[PDB]
Unconditional design. Structure first.
Ligand code: ATP
Ligand code: MG
Ligand code: MG
Lengths: 327, 332
């Protein structure tokens, strides 16, 4: 029975984190929580009550935070969360024009176009620095191939603009190619960013695991979320150094339904499922996952953002009810 | 008669240029094509000739020149070199739903105005220490105002109502921020145009769910690469949309998505629609509108027959069959 740091976040945050914990309870998941606010304080750091707690538990689950530096950026730097993982799979109860999406975007999360470095060269001339290093590219590439093996994925595509950015993207592509030659049971191709966008909105089923540097993954991960219904239903995890992982919602704070019981917990719930699979609790993952899918499929308790007329508590209750049926 | 430079390029470029010539002969178009080739060689002799020919003729029609990204950084994209030396600052594509090409979305009608010389395409990178590379995205006020001026004037002359600037100014506060700021400066002179802004991440999510909200879109170089290709996908793929590159004095026409097409070259399967439509934008630019309208209506009509469709739009027709059905509709 393991312990997980829980950061309910803001707005609808605490509501949906209570939903997740309640559903986890219905499922009898061997998981206990450790509620921890995080608020940027000076010394800019996260309150090390939580830093201590997460360094112990390793596993974390995080709600939406509101937007003076980015607190997601602080946690990113604090735990060295270098891999952003986004599995996008179509939801049978929620139909979009894309019904056969099963993609994992693996996004380098430390450098690239998010170096933090810009210069006003001269008034009206600005330079932004994209940073690619041999080490971060090697690590993200090793993570992608191990992820492909450890989740029985067959293909890994490196996405890049190395025709245009020969030295930066070309270095990233060189490291992927190097890991590809060592992990040859996972099949490897390379593809220009714009060809990936072009083909993605036409036939997303041709793609499996996608690994790319920071900005491309930032854009592509949201593109694929749009294929399957948006950020309200998209799980996400940031995997870091010292084994740490934090799984998170990427939707907004939604302060105006903040306490009106109309939030949608699906995304955080599916991130929690992702957490469970990361921890090895596959059975509890499968049951909670199926219960949420069946609820969405029904779908009498579709929350208002999924086109239904039903409060969060109804949606949450039914998932608990259904996961209780999977005995 | 006019003289136009033609760069066959690589992949499917040469074979499609031939079909362009055939259609021009059969339509009795008063245009002579002066060809310049660009080989695979690191030396810039050929690309320099092509630039100078385009300076002489001021109008070109080009295929895509292959960029081997395994060559050293010193060997730069010949497409980008030509674009930047001629200072063709506006890449303009018009993505519109084709009624005979049924995709997942209908009623798309987006004008994309992309900054075509600056940004992530400046070819500025270095290695400070071993295995630490920096690449320098450059945003300037003069080019950002230039592109925004094109986008607003285009919107107003076209009867469009809204301009949306696409950016990442929440992370690239100064670079993208300056780009936004120049858009806002221009917007002040076009108060009848609704001006909005959207983060590139969100833009892609909106494009694949409700692309009908967009009208005119303006953006720096890389974001335009991304958005051009999403939108081309939504309306049916790379074989359909023409692309224009405008400088103050020069104009170069090509397919919107700039694909070489090596894997389908010389198999008589490439869709010729985008290339023909670009050749019609060139004819329009030369003020030979009557020739443009004639070829454009034939090309759009052959698209209404699902049987003339090439495989990129779900059909099984070859390139030469499509060219025949274009020539058949050209009546004189
Ligand atoms: N005129 C056209 N008609 C049909 N398909 C096209 C056309 N132009 C480009 N494509 C397709 O668009 C895609 C991207 O173009 P790109 O130049 O990268 O192709 P490629 O490298 O030949 O593709 P592949 O990965 O299949 O070898 C390819 O699938 C190509 O076949
Ligand atoms: Mg994003
Ligand atoms: Mg190309």
């Amino acid at each position: 029975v393991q312990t997980v740091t829980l950061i309910p976040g803001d707005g609808i945050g605490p509501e949906i984190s209570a939903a997740v914990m309640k559903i986890f309870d219905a499922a009898k998941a061997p998981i206990q929580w450790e509620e921890r606010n995080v608020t940027a304080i000076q010394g800019w750091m996260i309150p090390s009550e939580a830093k201590e707690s997460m360094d112990k538990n390793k596993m974390g689950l995080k709600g939406p935070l509101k937007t003076h530096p980015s607190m997601n950026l602080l946690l990113r730097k604090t735990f060295d969360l270098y891999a952003n993982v986004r599995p996008c799979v179509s939801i049978e109860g929620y139909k979009t024009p894309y019904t056969d999406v099963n993609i994992v975007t693996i996004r380098e999360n430390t450098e690239g176009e998010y170096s933090g470095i810009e210069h006003v060269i001269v008034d009206g001339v600005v330079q932004s620095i994209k940073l690619i290093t041999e080490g971060a590219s090697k690590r993200i590439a090793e993570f992608a191939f191990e992820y492909a093996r450890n989740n029985h994925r067959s293909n890994v595509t490196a996405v890049h603009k190395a025709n245009i950015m020969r030295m930066s993207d070309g270095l990233f592509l060189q490291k992927c190619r190097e890991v590809a030659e060592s992990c040859k049971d996972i099949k490897f191709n390379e593809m220009y960013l714009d060809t990936v966008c072009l083909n993605m909105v036409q036939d997303p089923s041709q793609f499996d695991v996608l690994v790319m540097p920071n900005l491309y993954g930032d854009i592509l991960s949201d593109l694929c979320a749009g294929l399957i219904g948006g950020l309200g239903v998209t799980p996400s995890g940031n995997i870091g150094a010292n084994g740490v992982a934090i799984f998170e919602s990427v939707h907004g704070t939604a302060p105006d339904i903040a306490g009106k019981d109309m939030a949608n917990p699906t995304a955080l719930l599916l991130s929690a499922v992702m957490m469970l699979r990361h921890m090895g609790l596959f059975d509890h993952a499968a049951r909670i996952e199926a219960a949420c899918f069946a609820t969405i499929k029904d779908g009498k308790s579709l929350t208002k953002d999924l086109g239904g007329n039903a409060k969060c508590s109804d949606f949450t209750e039914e998932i608990c009810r259904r996961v209780k049926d999977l005995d | 008669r006019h003289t136009v430079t033609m760069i066959p390029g690589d992949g499917i470029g040469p074979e499609l240029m031939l079909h362009v010539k055939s259609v021009f002969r059969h339509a009795c178009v008063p245009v002579d094509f002066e060809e310049v080739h660009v080989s695979s060689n690191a030396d810039e002799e050929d690309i320099r000739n092509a630039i100078m020919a385009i300076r002489r003729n001021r109008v070109a029609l080009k295929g895509n020149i292959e960029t081997n990204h395994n060559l050293p950084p010193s060997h730069k994209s010949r497409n980008n070199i030509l674009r930047t030396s001629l200072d063709l600052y506006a890449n303009v594509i018009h993505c519109k739903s084709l009624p005979g090409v049924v995709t997942r979305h209908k009623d798309i009608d987006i004008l994309i105005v992309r900054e075509n010389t600056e940004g992530e395409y400046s070819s500025l990178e270095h290695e400070s220490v071993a295995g630490v590379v920096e690449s320098l995205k450059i945003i300037t006020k003069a080019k950002s105002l230039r592109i925004a001026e094109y986008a607003f004037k285009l919107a107003q002359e076209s009867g469009r109502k809204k301009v949306t600037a696409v950016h990442k100014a929440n992370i690239m506060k100064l670079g993208d921020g300056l780009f936004l700021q120049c858009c806002r400066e221009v917007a002040a002179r076009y108060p009848q145009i609704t001006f909005e802004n959207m983060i590139v991440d969100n833009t892609t999510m909106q494009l694949v769910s409700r692309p009908q909200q967009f009208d005119v879109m303006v953006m720096p170089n890389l974001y335009g690469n991304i958005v051009n290709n999403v939108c081309a996908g939504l309306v049916g793929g790379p074989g359909l949309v023409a692309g224009a590159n405008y400088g103050h004095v020069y104009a170069v026409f090509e397919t919107a998505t700039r694909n070489t097409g090596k894997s389908i070259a010389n198999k008589n399967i490439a869709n010729p629609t985008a290339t023909l439509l670009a050749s019609c934008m060139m004819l329009d630019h030369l003020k030979l509108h009557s020739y443009a309208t004639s070829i454009r209506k034939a090309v759009l009509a052959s698209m209404d027959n699902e049987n003339m469709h090439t495989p990129d739009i779900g059909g099984q027709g070859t390139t030469s069959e499509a060219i025949q059905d274009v020539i058949r509709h050209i009546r004189v």
